[PDB]
Amino acid sequence: FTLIELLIVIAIIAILAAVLIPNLLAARKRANDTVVTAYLNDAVKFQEMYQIDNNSYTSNQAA
Amino acid sequence: FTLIELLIVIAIIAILAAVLIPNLLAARKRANDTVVTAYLNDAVKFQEMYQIDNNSYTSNQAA
Ligand SMILES: *[C@H]1O[C@H](CO)[C@H](O)[C@H](O[C@H]2O[C@H](CO)[C@H](O)[C@H](O)[C@H]2NC(C)=O)[C@H]1NC(C)=O
Numbered sequence A, B: 001f002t003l004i005e006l007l008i009v010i011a012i013i014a015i016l017a018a019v020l021i022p023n024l025l026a027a028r029k030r031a032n033d034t035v036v037t038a039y040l041n042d043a044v045k046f047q048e049m050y051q052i053d054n055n056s057y058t059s060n061q062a063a
């Protein structure tokens, strides 16, 4: 094992470190939109439950 | 000490002076090829370092 093999190893590490890491921001954006969609789908279920009890929809989240 | 001993001494000096000196040219040839080999091994390390920075090899020594 010699300095030229070790420079090749360092060079290839620099390549793999650059390319094998995903765009984390783009991944989290799509997960975050799923949270919003899921929370609105829940708010919709609870608007219908409030409608069962009160014959009207809520304007306030605490209800 | 006499002229015949001194002629023997001169004769043996002439022999030792002829045989105890190495072929200097042949020795330097093998050392010189080692310099070339070592310099190309260095140029190879630096081609890999240029490849790390530029994603290409150099055509010019100044790089
Ligand atoms: C939902 O609650 C809101 C405050 O959290 C706000 O009060 C909205 O307006 C209501 O005001 C009172 C109830 O607080 C009224 O009797 C009606 O429910 C309603 N008034 C008007 C102007 O409609 C309430 N819902 C909405 C958006 O009407």
Ligand SMILES: *[C@H]1O[C@H](CO)[C@H](O)[C@H](O[C@H]2O[C@H](CO)[C@H](O)[C@H](O)[C@H]2NC(C)=O)[C@H]1NC(C)=O
Pocket (backbone or CB within 6 Å): B058, B059, B060
């Ligand atoms: C390495 O440098 C050479 C001069 O020192 C020479 O320029 C070679 O050719 C390049 O020419 C320019 C860069 O100077 C180009 O944009 C390319 O890098 C290259 N051109 C061609 C024809 O390939 C350059 N490397 C080599 C041998 O291509």
Ligand SMILES: *[C@H]1O[C@H](CO)[C@H](O)[C@H](O)[C@H]1NC(C)=O
Pocket (backbone or CB within 6 Å): A060, A062, A063
């Ligand atoms: C929801 O009910 C709780 C008690 O169960 C509190 O009264 C709260 O204030 C209610 N939210 C609103 C403001 O409608």
Ligand SMILES: *[C@H]1O[C@H](CO)[C@H](O)[C@H](O)[C@H]1NC(C)=O
Pocket (backbone or CB within 6 Å): B060, B062, B063
């Ligand atoms: C190497 O870099 C030096 C500066 O650090 C000079 O710019 C020199 O010209 C370079 N060699 C070439 C020609 O690539």
